Design a protein around this ligand. Structure first.
Ligand SMILES: *C(=O)/C=C/c1ccc(O)cc1
Length: 125
C-alpha cells in the first residue's frame, strides 16, 4: 500500500510524486482529468469500484463518454466552475449508476499541482 488518507489536506503534493504504478497502491479511487474532462490517469482502486478497465479508459472524456451520470450541475457543473476559476476543492456524496449496479460513493475533487489538471478521488460509503 501507498499510505495516503482520503481527504488529506496536502494530498495534491503527495500525489505529485507518483507514477501510474504508485497510484495503483492507493486505498481509494483516483482519476486525473485535464481541463476538458479527458482522463489522464485512472487507478486500480477506481476500476475495482466501477468495473472499468483502467487502461482502456485513459484518453476518453469522463463526462461525455465514461460517466454520463456525472453530467449534472451537482458534479460536472462543479468541475467546470473549478476549471474556469482555477481553484477547486469540494467533497460530496454521489451515486454512480451507468451500466453498473448503483454504488454510493464519496467524491473529492481537487485541483492538482500540475497546471491544467484536476483530481477526482472516490471511496465507497
Ligand atoms: C455515472 O455514469 C458514473 C460513472 C462512472 C464513475 C466513475 C468511474 O470511474 C467510471 C464511471
Amino acid at each position: 500500500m501507498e499510505h495516503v488518507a482520503f481527504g488529506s489536506e496536502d494530498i495534491e503534493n503527495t500525489l505529485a510524486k507518483m507514477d501510474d504504478g504508485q497510484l495503483d497502491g492507493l486505498a481509494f479511487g483516483a482519476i486525473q482529468l485535464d481541463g476538458d474532462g479527458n482522463i489522464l490517469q485512472y487507478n486500480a482502486a477506481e476500476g475495482d469500484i466501477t468495473g472499468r478497465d483502467p487502461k482502456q479508459v485513459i484518453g476518453k472524456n469522463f463526462f461525455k463518454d465514461v460517466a454520463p451520470c456525472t453530467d449534472s450541475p451537482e458534479f460536472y457543473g462543479k468541475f467546470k466552475e473549478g476549471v474556469a476559476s482555477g481553484n477547486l476543492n469540494t467533497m460530496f456524496e454521489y451515486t454512480f449508476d451507468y451500466q453498473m449496479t448503483p454504488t454510493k460513493v464519496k467524491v473529492h475533487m481537487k485541483k492538482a499541482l500540475s497546471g491544467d489538471s484536476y483530481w477526482v478521488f472516490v471511496k465507497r460509503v
